[PDB]
Paper text:
There are four Ube2S-ubiquitin conjugates in the asymmetric unit. Within each conjugate (in cis) only few contacts are formed between Ube2S and the donor ubiquitin (interface area ~ 180 Å2), resulting in an open configuration. The hydrophobic surface patch on the globular core of ubiquitin, centered about Leu 8, Ile 44, and Val 70, instead forms an interface with a neighboring E2 molecule in trans. This interface resembles the one seen in the closed NMR-derived docked complex. While the contacting surfaces in both models are quite similar in their residue composition and size (~ 590 Å2 in the crystal structure versus ~ 510 Å2 in the docked model), the donor ubiquitin molecules are pivoted by ~ 40° with respect to each other. In line with our analysis of the crystallographic lattice contacts, this indicates that the interface between Ube2S and ubiquitin that we observed in the crystal structure in trans is not dominated by other lattice contacts with neighboring molecules, but represents a low-energy state, independent of the crystal environment.
Ube2S has an inherent specificity for the formation of Lys 11-linkages, even in the absence of the APC/C. Nevertheless, the interactions between Ube2S and its ubiquitin substrates are weak and at the limit of direct experimental detection.
Author numbering: 7 to 156
The structure:
């Protein structure tokens, strides 16, 4: 139940964003509810997630864009910043957020997160500790779950 003038702004972003998304990212056409966007993020090459295709959904909350969107991975993944429910915690984004950044910036931030995790704010503390204490162990399991779910 976003304000109509906000919906009018969302339709603009999504329409442009869908016709020309960032690399490795694809926003699916939404004509039902643009508050609930469906997106795929290709696992970056040179990362454990490489080769995998990760389905996610971006939810625009009630106080959007005053507050940042809330992302959720549908694809199961081993990442310090992704919870069991798939909830994505982008600590830096939520701090450096304003209404002008746009949905494109959010998706980019999530892609950058697969490359540059943040164990200082881990929803998956196991993946958080492993990333710091034994990266090779993290890369192994992350690469394994990417072969199965990616």
């Amino acid at each position: 139940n976003l304000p109509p003038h906000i919906i009018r702004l969302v339709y603009k972003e999504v329409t442009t964003l869908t016709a020309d998304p960032p690399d490795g990212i694809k926003v699916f056409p939404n004509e039902e509810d643009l508050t609930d966007l469906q997106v795929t993020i290709e696992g970056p090459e040179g990362t454990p997630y490489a080769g995998g295709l990760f389905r996610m959904k971006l939810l625009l909350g009630k106080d959007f864009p005053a507050s940042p969107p809330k992302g959720y991975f549908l694809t199961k993944i081993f990442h310090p910043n992704v919870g069991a429910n798939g909830e994505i915690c982008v600590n830096v984004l939520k701090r450096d957020w304003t209404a002008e950044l746009g949905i494109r910036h959010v998706l980019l931030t999530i892609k950058m997160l697969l490359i540059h995790p943040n164990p200082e704010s881990a929803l998956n503390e196991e993946a958080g500790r492993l990333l710091l204490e034994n990266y090779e162990e993290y890369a192994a399991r992350a690469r394994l779950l990417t072969e199965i779910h990616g």
